[PDB]
Symmetry: C2
Subunit: 91 residues, 2 copies
């Protein structure tokens, strides 16, 4: 609750902000808060390598069958951050 | 409130996140929600010395989220972007855990 505890968490906080600092990476995470989407559905949703950066960050996971690859948001902190951004930025 | 609306402000959102993506910039903003601090007070608060402190404060000036107050004695920094303060508040709710 204090700035002293926040200071101890800073590198982890700054890293998540770094993961969402790319607009494409932000829109992908914003889509993913609603549920699991295939790569095809995400292309339809965001109208666009960035999923790779997201995989590497560990905030998303993949589900794969013989037909397709599905992306799911696993870091609840990213979803809560994405949620807060709507409250702050929607006008 | 919609993703269509969010998509229209995606570059602005991503820019504020880029400004706060450096841990030093993040600790400076977290300090600055509390009130106005001198460069000297900020050095005492975050435990980072020169040139790092002024280099990161400079990035924050360029972003337009902090302003300066200067007299004959010193320079003071203040957080002006309410969106950054609101983001800081949300980060406390998300990141604080006992």
């Amino acid at each position: 609750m204090t700035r002293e505890d926040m200071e101890k968490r800073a590198n982890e906080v700054a890293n998540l902000l770094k993961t969402l600092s790319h607009p494409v990476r932000l829109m992908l995470v914003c889509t993913l808060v609603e549920g699991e989407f295939s790569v095809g559905e995400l292309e339809q949703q965001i109208g666009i390598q960035q999923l790779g950066v997201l995989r590497e960050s560990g905030i998303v996971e993949t589900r794969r069958n013989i037909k397709q690859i599905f992306y799911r948001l696993t870091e609840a902190k990213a979803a809560q951050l994405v949620n807060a951004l709507y409250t702050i930025f929607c006008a």
